[PDB]
Design a protein around this ligand. Structure first.
Ligand code: XUL
Length: 525
């Protein structure tokens, strides 16, 4: 039973899965931060600082969690000698600042001791900024002004400046703690930091997670000199050149061979971001999209060429370094669906489904926007309802309200996807996951709006599983072979809905009208 390990250095936990050569998951284990390392005093794996904007995690908690999980696997009888390769994912954007002299500690690890004891003094910043941080608005405005504006920054790096993006965090550390910055020999993402621990040497950053920093020129796949210089001096030397995501960055350290029994030939394939790893785990291809439904709704897009915008995030693709992917984030998700259910259909998901069944595609021309909190994609707030004549109305009948919400949410996803260059193709598959993917009637609207089949997939471990798939891709030939050919053996998602006859005619006319009403609301602010 030869296998690969797929790791996930997440916000709240470190998780691992073991996947066999037939691409079956047969083992899973985790270490949860608040529960298993309570002495760090985190809540949800992080520290929200007094300003209410700075959000960090202790780097040595992440190292100690790796020690705990490897010892927990060993105590359970995990056979490490069967591990051919490993890869992993890191929560995106978060950064690690390695102190001058730290690589000497990494390359001289003794198997008699734990990682935490030996790496105790290796970090110039103890509290790492994570993806939840929103304390760098001044640095975002500075970076955009330095390179010719928000659109110029987006053309270049796939995104305008976002507070959590690494370049803005590095700029803030340079500005506020120049002594710690000047004593930093290396800056890693959570992904490349975790890979470095397994290598026992510094791992490079991959193209895909490297695209979440407002630093990488996504098309030429080199660091932007203009972005680097606007964030902090001598930054290129601290990052090192980025690499294709499907790169063998080295063999596992002899530390793991000797301490846990990994075979000496065990390969370490470059780590990537959790969203890129989930795209690999979901096995998206050209023409495909994934809709992750939850408190936030997240759209995962495959893109052959990028059309970066003031919304969304375009990254280099982790399973095909010549192409791209995108994320579009929607803040009004499952809480809006629950509120409409409670207000209009007696708090019943069965009546919610009946409302969709009892209304026609296109909802008689009744259109709605439902943003109780400020939306990200695009920046609108409020509930905005329009009747068949495009007149603004105060309310809808309950069944019309349910369909307006669901149709509107999915039409918004299509319009904003298409704004980044996405197009539905004949081969297109739609992957749906999360709470609302357990509602066939919701998935039917999604199929109708995109005029493409919808498949349901469990993604509780998608970043772990995607990481193990990427490790197998490395072993199967890497860049010499297509990722999709390696993972054809993995279990297929199940078909939940196909577009109803006439869907194409309904939404070809309604999508432009929804897009114009959205522009009307944005122009009135
Ligand atoms: O910040 C982002 C994406 O831009 C989150 O999805 C984190 O990657 C979660 O760990």
């Amino acid at each position: 039973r030869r296998c690969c390990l797929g790791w996930d250095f997440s916000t709240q936990q470190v998780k691992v899965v073991a996947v066999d050569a037939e691409l079956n998951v047969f083992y899973e284990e985790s270490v949860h931060f608040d529960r298993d390392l309570p002495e760090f005093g985190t809540q949800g794996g992080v520290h929200v600082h007094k300003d209410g904007l700075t959000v960090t995690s202790p780097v040595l908690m992440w190292v100690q969690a790796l020690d705990i999980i490897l010892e927990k696997m060993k105590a359970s009888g995990f056979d490490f000698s069967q591990v051919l390769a490993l890869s992993g994912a890191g929560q995106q954007h978060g950064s690690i600042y390695w102190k001058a002299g730290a690589q000497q500690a990494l390359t001289s690890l003794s198997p008699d001791l734990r990682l935490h004891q030996q790496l105790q003094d290796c970090f110039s910043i103890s509290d790492c900024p994570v993806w939840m941080d929103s304390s760098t608005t001044a640095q975002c405005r500075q970076l955009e002004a330095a390179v010719g504006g928000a659109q110029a920054l987006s053309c270049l790096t796939g995104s305008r400046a976002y507070e959590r993006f690494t370049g803005n965090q590095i700029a803030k550390i340079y500005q506020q703690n120049p002594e710690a910055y000047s004593h930093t020999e290396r800056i890693s993402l959570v992904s490349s930091f975790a890979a470095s621990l397994f290598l026992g040497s510094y791992s490079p950053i991959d193209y895909s997670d490297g695209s979440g920093m407002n630093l990488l020129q996504i098309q030429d796949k080199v660091w932007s000199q203009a972005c680097l210089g606007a964030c902090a001096p001598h930054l290129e030397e601290k990052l090192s050149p980025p690499v294709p995501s499907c790169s063998v960055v080295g063999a596992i350290s002899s530390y793991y061979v000797q301490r846990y029994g990994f075979p000496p030939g065990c390969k370490v394939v470059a780590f990537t971001g959790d969203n890129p790893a989930s795209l690999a785990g979901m096995r998206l291809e050209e023409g495909d999209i994934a809709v992750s439904l939850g408190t936030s709704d997240t759209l995962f897009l495959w893109l052959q060429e990028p059309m970066p915008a003031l919304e969304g995030h375009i990254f280099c693709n982790p399973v095909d370094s010549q192409h791209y992917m995108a994320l579009l984030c929607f803040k009004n998700g499952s809480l809006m669906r629950e509120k409409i259910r409670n207000e209009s259909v007696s708090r019943s998901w069965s009546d919610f489904s009946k409302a969709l069944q009892s209304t026609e595609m296109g909802n008689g021309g009744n259109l709605g926007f439902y943003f109780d909190v400020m939306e990200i994609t695009p920046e609108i707030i409020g509930r905005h309802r329009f009747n068949t004549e495009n007149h603004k109305v105060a309310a809808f009948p309950g069944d019309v309200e349910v369909r307006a919400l669901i149709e509107g949410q999915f039409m918004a996803k299509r319009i904003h996807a298409e704004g980044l260059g996405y197009r539905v193709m004949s081969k297109t598959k739609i992957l749906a996951t999360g709470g609302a993917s357990h509602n066939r009637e919701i998935l039917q609207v999604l199929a109708d709006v995109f005029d493409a089949p919808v498949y349901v997939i469990d993604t509780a471990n998608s970043a772990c599983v995607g990481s193990a798939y990427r490790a197998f891709h490395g072993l199967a030939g890497g860049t010499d072979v297509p990722f999709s050919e390696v993972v054809k053996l993995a279990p297929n998602p199940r078909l939940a809905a196909t577009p109803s006859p006439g869907a194409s005619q309904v939404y070809e006319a309604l999508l432009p009208q929804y897009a114009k009403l959205e522009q009307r609301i944005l122009s009135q602010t």
